[PDB]
């Protein structure tokens, strides 16, 4: 069972008046536990999962000043582009940085990540190797010859592969009850006649943990694609997942088709009959 | 825990 | 860049007519961030609706998801109402317990 920690940073200026709208979060796996949002009072970085409430004032004093520089950053990066680009003061744009490692089921460095866009397109990413850029266009090449000069790279890999795997470590460890649970998808089929003829039998994965699911579908014992609609995964809302797939079949044919669910917490796919 | 170094672009 | 939101209308728990839910409105694969999202009873916006924090998937589009305490009935209906730059005049999904 792999693992990641990732943030997610955005900001979005504010045109005629004051500082950009800056919002942070920080989840490990699929579980937001922290959030920094400038437009709130309280101007600290926040808890979002019990488990990381266990940590002390020193742990919130630190990640609320980081956070804030990372503000101070964005803000910067904001004004920059808008010169690299010769844009106008006039609209509103856009920074995106995120940022993480993964490890694998030895809780071991397995992939780093830091990457940015403006106005939702890639601008630049640090490669798999954590030692060169991918710089999308030539404003992009600007920042990666002053990052390469002020070797950026390598005090990135420091944290990646270092400290950024430690305290996953730590949260894996201090959020176990939960983190390292396996919420196996609860399954059922609904099925509805369209017309006398025709009918939409319908496979639900509910209450699941991780995200991470695959419903198909099979006639007779192969796989089905056409006539089936698979929704996109989504949050219930508890910090589990949803997902549906449908498929039409001729009215009386019900038995011919069986849903297939793979899942991390099932040891065995499970099969659905109508 | 959050990178504590940040550089700009 | 300009993309519009994927939006799905549904429940926390299952759908039982009389028993105390949440209704949910998630929005994705949109961008820019800037969205107005209501949760209509009736066609009338919910007034305490919460949302979670803006965050984004591997292609930079965001996402959030809207929620509210809720519960089904037979004859109220439910819907979402969704605003974006992208959209000429205001898209309304109604909750469907099938869907």
Known sequence: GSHSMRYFFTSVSRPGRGEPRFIAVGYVDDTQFVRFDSDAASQRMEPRAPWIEQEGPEYWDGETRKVKAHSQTHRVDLGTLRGYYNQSEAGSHTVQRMYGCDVGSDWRFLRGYHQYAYDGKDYIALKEDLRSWTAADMAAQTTKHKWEAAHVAEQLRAYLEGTCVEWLRRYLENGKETLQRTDAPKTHMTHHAVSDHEATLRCWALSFYPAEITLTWQRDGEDQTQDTELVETRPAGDGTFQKWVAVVVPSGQEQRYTCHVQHEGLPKPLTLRW | ?9 | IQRTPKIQVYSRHPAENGKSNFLNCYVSGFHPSDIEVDLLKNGERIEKVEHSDLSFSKDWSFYLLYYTEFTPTEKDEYACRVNHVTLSQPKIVKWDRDM
């Open chain 2, 1 to 9: 825990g959050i990178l504590g170094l940040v550089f700009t672009l």
